[PDB]
């Protein structure tokens, strides 16, 4: 699934500073994904998801999104680890910072992004 022009906020999951441990950050998906390999947990930065198109909640856990800053064209791939309110994304700060290439997202409090569910790879 995909959608355009969705709001992405940020939350301090601090994934890296929690050793990529989903239980430590209190991620919804910890119940099913916390014991996946370290290589899997740490492959991609983390997000909450609650977009207009595609699964959310339990069915979305562990899936990957390609996210594009509509304003700057910066991109990254994230892993769904949590659920959110809003019809968009709640990115870990590290991910938001990566995408916020002009700093305007930090100032306003959100980015406008497109997303697409993508193969997570191996």
Rounded CA separation 69/76 (Å): 9
List, in order, residues 6 or more apart from 42 with CB less than 8 Å away.
15, 16, 20
Q: What is the DSSP annotation of 32-57?
A: HHTTS-HHHHTSSEEEEE--SSS--G
The pair of structure tokens assigned to 8 is 């992405």
Helices in 1-122 by DSSP H: which ranges?
Answer: 30-33, 38-41, 93-99, 104-108
* Numbers of helices and strands, H then E, in the chain: 4, 6
The helix, strand and coil proportions of the chain, stated in percent and rounded to the nearest 5, come to 20, 35, 45
Elucidated via: X-ray
Count of domains for the chain: 1
Rounded CA separation 8/54 (Å): 16
- Name the β-bridge partners of 7: 112
CA atoms within 13 A on the CB side of 98: 14
95: helix, coil or strand? Answer: helix
Long-range contacts from 41-45, C-beta under 8 angstroms, 24+ separation: 41/79, 42/15, 42/16, 43/79, 43/120, 43/121, 44/76, 44/77, 44/78, 44/79, 44/120, 45/15, 45/76, 45/78, 45/79, 45/91, 45/92, 45/94, 45/95, 45/98
Can you give the residue range of the structural domain that contains 92?
Answer: 2-122
Identify the sign of the CA torsion 10, 15, 84, 55: positive
Q: 48 with 13: CB under 8 angstroms?
A: no
**97 secondary structure, DSSP code:** H
**28 secondary structure, DSSP code:** T
What CATH number does residue 95 fall under?
2.40.40.10
């Amino acid at each position: 699934q995909s959608a355009s022009n969705v709001r992405a906020t940020y939350h301090f999951y601090n994934a890296q500073q929690n050793g990529w441990d989903l239980r430590k950050v209190s991620a919804y998906c910890a119940t099913w994904d916390a014991d996946k390999p370290y290589s899997w947990r740490s492959k991609y930065g983390w997000t909450a998801f609650c977009g207009p198109v595609g699964p959310h909640g339990r069915a979305a856990c562990g899936k990957c999104l390609r996210v594009t800053n509509t304003k700057t064209r910066a991109e990254t791939t994230v892993r769904i680890v949590d659920q959110c309110s809003n019809g968009g994304l709640d990115l870990d700060w590290s991910v938001f910072k990566k995408l916020d290439t002009d700093g305007s997202g930090y100032l306003r409090g959100h980015l406008i992004v497109n997303y697409q569910f993508v193969n997570c790879g191996n």
